[PDB]
Amino acid sequence: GHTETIKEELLSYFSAIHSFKAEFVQTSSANNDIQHGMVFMKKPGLLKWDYYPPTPASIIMHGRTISYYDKELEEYSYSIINNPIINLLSSDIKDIKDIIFLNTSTTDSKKVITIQDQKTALLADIIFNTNPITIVGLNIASPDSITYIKFYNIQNNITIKDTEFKHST
Ligand SMILES: [Cl-]
C-alpha cells in the first residue's frame, strides 16, 4: 500500500537477516530448464552461488562486480555489472538507492514485498516466512521473462567467514 510503510517492513525483515546459507532451486518461464545449487549471503554486501554439475560454477557478487569461476574449464572472469536486484539480498536496506517499493501482500502466514529497480525497470517479489523471519523466495519479472528462485534448508544468522567469499589460483 503506502510506500514508506512498505520500506519500514522490508528494512525490518532484512535487519532480522544478518546472513544465511541455503540451497536454491531456480527456473524460468523462458524454458523448461531447472537449476540447483547452494547460496551464501553475508549482509555487508557479500553474495555467493554454487551452481551444480549440470552447469558447474561458482559466482561471487558484490555491488557492480561479478567473479565467475567455471570449475569445468577452471577459468576465472572478473566483470563489472550493475545487477541492483539480486544483490539486494545482501544489502542494508537503509543504504539502498534507486528503488521503488510498490506493494506488500500478506496471506497464509507469509509475507510478499514488491519492488522495482528504477534503472532496469525489473520487478522483484520477495517472499518471507513470517515466523521465523526467513527469506524463502525471490522472483524477478520483466515483460519478456520471469525467473523464480526458491530457497530451502535455510540457516539464518549463521557464521560464515569472509574467506568463504573468495577463490584464487
Ligand atoms: Cl490479504
Side-chain angles (χ1 to χ4, degrees), residues 1-93 95-96 98-160 162-165 167-169:
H2 297 79
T3 300
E4 194 68 352
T5 294
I6 293 168
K7 193 183 181 71
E8 294 171 342
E9 296 182 6
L10 179 58
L11 73 83
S12 166
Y13 289 121
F14 261 83
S15 308
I17 310 293
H18 304 154
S19 67
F20 69 79
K21 177 178 173 174
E23 279 180 315
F24 81 89
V25 168
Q26 173 183 33
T27 177
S28 169
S29 64
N31 55 62
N32 228 332
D33 286 351
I34 280 56
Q35 312 189 22
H36 311 263
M38 280 290 287
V39 60
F40 302 78
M41 188 283 285
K42 199 172 186 179
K43 209 67 168 207
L46 308 173
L47 209 41
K48 175 178 168 187
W49 308 79
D50 283 4
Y51 279 90
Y52 274 2
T55 50
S58 178
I59 302 80
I60 299 190
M61 288 180 52
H62 173 277
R64 300 194 66 188
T65 83
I66 319 184
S67 175
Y68 185 104
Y69 172 57
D70 187 7
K71 320 196 182 114
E72 273 175 349
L73 316 179
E74 307 194 349
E75 267 196 332
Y76 290 82
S77 306
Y78 183 85
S79 45
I80 270 49
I81 215 70
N82 293 120
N83 195 330
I85 282 170
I86 281 284
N87 272 329
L88 174 137
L89 296 172
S90 67
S91 77
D92 181 323
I93 300 296
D95 312 325
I96 66 104
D98 298 331
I99 291 296
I100 315 97
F101 315 101
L102 305 175
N103 199 259
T104 169
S105 173
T106 315
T107 306
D108 184 70
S109 301
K110 187 177 299 310
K111 196 69 174 292
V112 179
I113 294 172
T114 306
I115 66 189
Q116 193 190 49
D117 172 60
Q118 289 172 24
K119 320 299 110 149
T120 65
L122 276 161
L123 296 165
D125 294 303
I126 307 161
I127 303 106
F128 313 82
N129 268 345
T130 60
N131 174 284
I133 304 169
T134 74
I135 309 172
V136 304
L138 176 57
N139 305 346
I140 307 183
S142 84
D144 297 322
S145 66
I146 187 181
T147 311
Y148 301 97
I149 309 183
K150 183 158 181 301
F151 310 108
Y152 56 109
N153 294 337
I154 300 175
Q155 319 180 45
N156 282 122
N157 297 37
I158 49 71
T159 306
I160 45 185
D162 303 317
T163 69
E164 218 288 353
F165 309 87
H167 306 74
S168 66
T169 66

